[PDB]
From Swiss-Prot:
Disease listed for this protein: Intellectual developmental disorder, autosomal dominant 65: An autosomal dominant form of intellectual disability, a disorder characterized by significantly below average general intellectual functioning associated with impairments in adaptive behavior and manifested during the developmental period. MRD65 is characterized by delayed motor and speech acquisition, variably impaired intellectual development, behavioral abnormalities, and dysmorphic facial features. Additional variable features include feeding difficulties, hypotonia, and seizures.
Compartments where located: Nucleus
Protein's job: Histone demethylase that specifically demethylates 'Lys-9' of histone H3, thereby playing a role in histone code. Does not demethylate histone H3 'Lys-4', H3 'Lys-27', H3 'Lys-36' nor H4 'Lys-20'. Only able to demethylate trimethylated H3 'Lys-9', with a weaker activity than KDM4A, KDM4C and KDM4D. Demethylation of Lys residue generates formaldehyde and succinate. Plays a critical role in the development of the central nervous system (CNS).
Domain spans labelled Tudor: 5-62, 63-119
Recorded family membership: Belongs to the JHDM3 histone demethylase family.
Entry note about domains: The 2 Tudor domains recognize and bind methylated histones. Double Tudor domain has an interdigitated structure and the unusual fold is required for its ability to bind methylated histone tails.
Protein's name according to its UniProt entry: Lysine-specific demethylase 4B
Gene: KDM4B
Stretch of the intact protein here: 915 to 1040 of 1096
Top-rank taxon: Eukaryota
Amino acid sequence: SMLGADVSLGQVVITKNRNGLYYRCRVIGAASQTCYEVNFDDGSYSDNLYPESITSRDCVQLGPPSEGELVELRWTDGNLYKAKFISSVTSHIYQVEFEDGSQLTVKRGDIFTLEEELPKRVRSRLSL
Ligand SMILES: [Cl-]
């Protein structure tokens, strides 16, 4: 959900465009994305797992497993795998529109609000 989001619809923010420059732009859409972080038995992980992928618990109905809980999941190859559940992360993603009417989907970490202090790297590439 948008619970805890720190950017509002209609907010002016700064982000990098397709062309490499940073511009003001307005937020026109907002969404949340919940992914789980699981540790496979070969030592690898995924922090992009769809909650629906968990087959040892109905996570859509019941919410996430407990941290550290052993789970089973169905991967995108259609096969079942054991893993350790680590955490659930809900992140907010925004759609922005630039002056020219072009649009981009942007993760919160790639947005600057107008109050934040901007990197020198960024101030250098900021269009008027
Ligand atoms: Cl693999």
